[PDB]
Amino acid sequence: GEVGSLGLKVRSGRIYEEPRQALRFPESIKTFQLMMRDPSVAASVNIIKMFVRKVNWRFVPPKGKEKDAKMIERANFFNSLMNDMEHDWADFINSVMSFCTYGFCV
């Protein structure tokens, strides 16, 4: 059993980890826009997004059972349904790539 707890900050629902007021979610958003304005920061967090959005994805059965017809047809169905989304996979990667600017993306 979990005899302890990974209690991070739990101040008032908002995570109060960062001891600096500016870099907390109510104002961290602005702070991140302000720092995003800078050229060096913009290019440095743009190259990472670049590299992530460069590769493509294709579903693959596990190390073993890669010859099973069930796994192959499941992979085909997964890939087709990935292409069946109204927003393309690349668009999903684009939406995720807010990842760098904030550290999380729901």
Place this chain on the structure above:
Amino acid sequence: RDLVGMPKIGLPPDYLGEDAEPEKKAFVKYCQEVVNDLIANDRAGLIWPRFIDPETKEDIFEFSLVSRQGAKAYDTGSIIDRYSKQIMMAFMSDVLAMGQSKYGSFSLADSKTSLLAMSVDI
């Protein structure tokens, strides 16, 4: 607005005016042409009147080149160069300044694709 070296002519207030004697007014007119037409040709030179006033021990007429006693604080030349690289860095177009290298290429299928070349791929 870098007026260093500009010719400055100092005349007594009597010379400058409309009621001044014709001789004085003729002198002012000549100084106007001298200002307007002086260059650094072969026959460049000057024959100016010189009278050191016994009082104040200073001359009344002088032809002098205006001089500055300082230097501009910031070097504008290196300042602009920094921003130009930063702009190219934002678009990752350093190939415009640096030029084509022998280890960079624009070919997508090549194993050494340039940063800018991959951007067009995206």
